[PDB]
Subunit: 355 residues, 4 copies
């Protein structure tokens, strides 16, 4: 079923229980998937939400940071993450032309709980472009779809491939979409968990590499129909500047699968940490204590977090491909990579299970 | 006398363009949609302002551009590609913090008919300030129709200031705030370029107000109080993406001179675009052109005059927003316009003379 | 001599610390080495200024730190790890542009004896401005011995200003420039923290000079002219690396108010460090400790008072440099000190009063 | 001799004549190698210089940009590169504690030619840490060594491994140091050349990857003694913001060999382009025309430059390892990877010659 279940092991680290971003305790994920056949008005899109906390994000801010490998994409809520490193909302993935509707729907969702608290809601919404398989000009994603994803957001196993925001996506000229993975550090390394959730929509066929092996080079013959957003989570107590460091390691994971070299690819990365809690919620005009006690991972412990994030992102992307299935829409056809076809290509270029 | 300069108050040392507005950069157009409706705590005092960077469709003639963030406690769309590639390919819009998404997706929808099978993803630039005091900002009352009204209203010439468009419900230095604009023209020996600024001023505490350097805020503390700033700089200088970033940061200088830039809570986000290069290729993925494009670059020994001009334009734009602001009562809060006669009196009191 | 505040000139609204200097941040030390030697075109008017962030060795008690660059037309060492990890682990030094390397490597050498098999690579912070008009800057006259002299002279208490240390041959607003310092203390209800600034001012055109907002430069154009600014901000507030970056950018605000920030040629580079967290681990690669360190963070509803204080401290520090500057004739160039009486006359002419 | 001569192909691209950064016309490289045994005062260090032009850099500035993957390192001259994107000097590599002496030596070198022109010289100097094999506290590099490297700077083949600045460096717990490589685009893509020169001093044994194959995993048994600076050059007419984009692709090449996950690693990248010439030399007080006509690579042509740079960086790193030999110094021993041992490790993980 998933990459690791095929005996394909990415990197050297050990996954958490679900091998998903939800292995970071409290983190929840929900999809809303739109699939409707209607000629050039066919809908192949949706929205994915990440809740950073067990409860409302506004009440328990997370330290966070962003890194942009290639900004050919759109996002909301990132400027305050750059400035103050505080994630105070859910995170959502959708298509390029639906970002605003999704963002303002997330704002409306906090209206009722705003008990006269003075603040301006700034949700984080990121995107990739499903213009080939989806009627992206049709702007078919609505607040109701955001509410369905929010209601479905839960811990445990996370559906992958052509679901939620990844529904109409294409990766390495195969079916793309949602992928997730995690790594758990050893006790002597802090015992922290690092998880990643990607929406993979990038890359040319020949460049595909799986566990390092040049599998793309022997997969050129397969028919082709012819951006990637990454969230990294960890329960390590990382400060804002450390979340920035962690986010950039998404470049490392993406590069190892064969990405990061396209002008057209919106490669935008976010990392948040749950280790520090009890951070002050924004409520302007209402002042608390001058300082807050927080914890910081010492820099001689942060490399094991970099390694883990890089692995989690790499496997998350390959998981997206493995979960991908055939899609025909609006006159375009994309094939799922195929579990057996991947195993065959791996063997052809010298990979073997348990070497 | 209506605007700052008309009162005999001169900001900086430079010479303004004909309208003393961002529209003094040829082809740049500005349009407002102003929303006013009384309904207790659901009162509407907000709207949208749009900037057209070109005489025609922004998509067909991209502008080099850059952003600078003095304090990112605010939201914006369309900025990541500006950072990456420095290309403005859409109109610019101002609105309130909770309407950014609706405005942005309305701007995406507006380009649908003209797309005609060209492959690209629309990424409009939308910025905001917070009108939560005078406006029902949780009400999300701005819609696509309001964006379409602002677009159709976009025009050259004089730009309405104060409580209009996106500035309708804004508050600055505890007076009425909102839209402000100004411009500077360089001498011919310096390239003859025009630099314009359009601000949505919603920042600042009373005591900090400075007009032409004079501490007028210190003698205006007695005036009743009801208790972010987005800046666009435009120029017809042929600035490259990295030069637009340099130009954008000079909004810090202008803002600082009026008494801003020291609030944690203030979304101070600046954008600068240049119209001097007008032969840039429109985005059309899958459709490949020639390897290179010849472009123009301002030499660095000519860019300082543009820095000065931008700083002065931003400074006067903010003071213009204040001078144009009028009294507003809404949702149980009252704010006073600074007042032309009152500003002159305060100026004289702290030693200023015409 | 008399400083700005002694002339009855008050910058901003805040209250200075005891020495009105960066040394008001407890433990911080400053030392100058001043080279002044008349020798025709080989005249030496330069030197080095050092800041010790701690009472003892910087390496043993790192400070959280951040940088902001308003205009990167200058050179600096040690900034990349400050950007990356926000850790100041060395003294800070100011000198001229062509002596940065010798000064940097001398600071490396200074830690050699204390290294005692500890595994790390020394990365001192060295910044500069250009004294090429009054100083034989191609002569590269600054050496390790001068760095040791500054180091040995580093102490708390009053800091000499003007044409001393790194500021010896510097020029500001076409008057004598150089070293300036100032501080602000927050009220107890605001955390009671101290914010200090030390600048080496070498920027600006005459007409642009503003003192306490008043446009004195405009009435000082007649004064003969001989024709970058590095800023360090310190605070005992417990600021995290990302917060030090925010604080550092407020040097843009202070600098703007005196009339800077609009020159392509000006290396305007700012560093801010905080001493509030003092239990940070010294770098020793290969020798690992506990997984985490508990630290303190200033809450964001308390950081605005720090922004204000930093901007005021930077502004007064620049004016302090000008006030302390005296006449210098060197290498065929003459620059005048602003002049205490001349400044007072100029201020009164444009409406200022004590 | 070199990686490609072993039948090992990195990426899909075609190298230039020298497979070196010198394949960008006019670019020159010179080494000064210090090797002296003297107990704990042994010298194993030096300096490498890059001339971006056939003549003096000051008189013909290059557009340039920087990217920092991990700023645990020191450099001079980068702030004006960030600000205005203008390279106006040679570039030098040395050890961490010699950066200042090398930089001021480069300033002094321009003195005679200054001839009353008003400017402040801001040379670009970068470093990695050779503290294990070299007496790095001894500060044994001087202006005379810089002058030797400058005089030795020439086009053509570039010596790799433990030479110049790479003399005492260590990579993946093998001998490290200088590596270089290049790629040439087809006439279809603009025909431009992309070159890279690295000083590789990073990485744990286990993570080493060659052409994707995880050879490090079967090389753990080899004895161990227990940063990377990259310059990318191209004759494409890249503007400063485009040079920044190109520089970040060093992250991709570095990631593919197994780097980018160490807190301790100063991973600092510079890219300059030679395509635009006649850029105005800095001479403050002496004013020219308001504008200059320059060229820009269109964004639908920049991806091939992205790919080329990532491939050149990757092969350059492996070239450094392949060129490395055994070194014993100051109580430490490091082994060269070994060409035959590498071919063996490659077969062990499924690699075979002849594609
Ligand atoms: Ca931080
Ligand atoms: Ca550029």
């Amino acid at each position: 079923m998933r990459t690791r279940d095929l005996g394909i092991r990415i990197g050297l680290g050990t996954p958490g229980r679900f091998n998903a971003i939800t292995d970071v305790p409290g983190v929840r994920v929900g999809h809303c998937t739109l699939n409707e056949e209607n000629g050039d008005a066919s809908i192949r899109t949706g929205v994915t939400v990440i809740e950073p906390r067990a409860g409302a994000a506004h009440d328990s801010p997370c330290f966070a940071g962003v890194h942009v490998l290639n900004g050919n994409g759109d996002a909301t809520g990132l400027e305050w993450i750059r400035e103050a490193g505080l994630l105070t909302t859910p995170i959502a993935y959708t298509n390029t032309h639906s970002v605003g509707a999704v963002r303002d729907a997330l704002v409306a969702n906090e209206r009722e709980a705003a008990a006269g608290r003075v603040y301006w809601c700034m949700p984080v919404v990121m995107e990739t472009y499903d213009g080939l398989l989806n009627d992206i000009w049709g702007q078919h994603v609505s607040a109701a779809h955001v509410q369905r994803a929010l209601a479905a957001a839960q811990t445990g196993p996370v559906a992958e491939g052509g679901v939620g925001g990844g529904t109409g996506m294409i990766c390495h000229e195969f079916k793309g979409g949602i992928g997730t993975a995690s790594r758990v550090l050893a006790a002597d390394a802090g015992g922290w968990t690092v998880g990643a959730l990607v929406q993979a929509n990038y890359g040319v066929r020949e460049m595909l590499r799986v566990a390092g092996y040049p599998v793309g080079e022997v997969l050129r013959h397969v028919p082709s129909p012819f951006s990637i957003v990454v969230t990294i989570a960890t329960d390590a107590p990382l400060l804002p500047h450390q979340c920035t460091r962690l986010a950039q390691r998404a470049s490392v994971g993406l590069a190892r699968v064969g990405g990061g070299t396209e002008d057209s690819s919106g490669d935008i990365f976010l990392a948040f940490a749950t280790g520090n809690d009890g951070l002050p919620a924004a409520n302007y005009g209402s002042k608390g204590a001058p300082t807050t006690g927080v914890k910081m991972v010492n820099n001689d412990h942060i490399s094991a977090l970099f390694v883990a994030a890089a692995e989690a992102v790499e496997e998350a992307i390959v998981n997206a491909l493995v979960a991908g299935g055939d899609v025909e829409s609006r006159g375009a056809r994309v094939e799922g990579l195929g579990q057996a076809r991947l195993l065959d290509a791996l063997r052809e270029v010298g990979w073997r299970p348990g070497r």
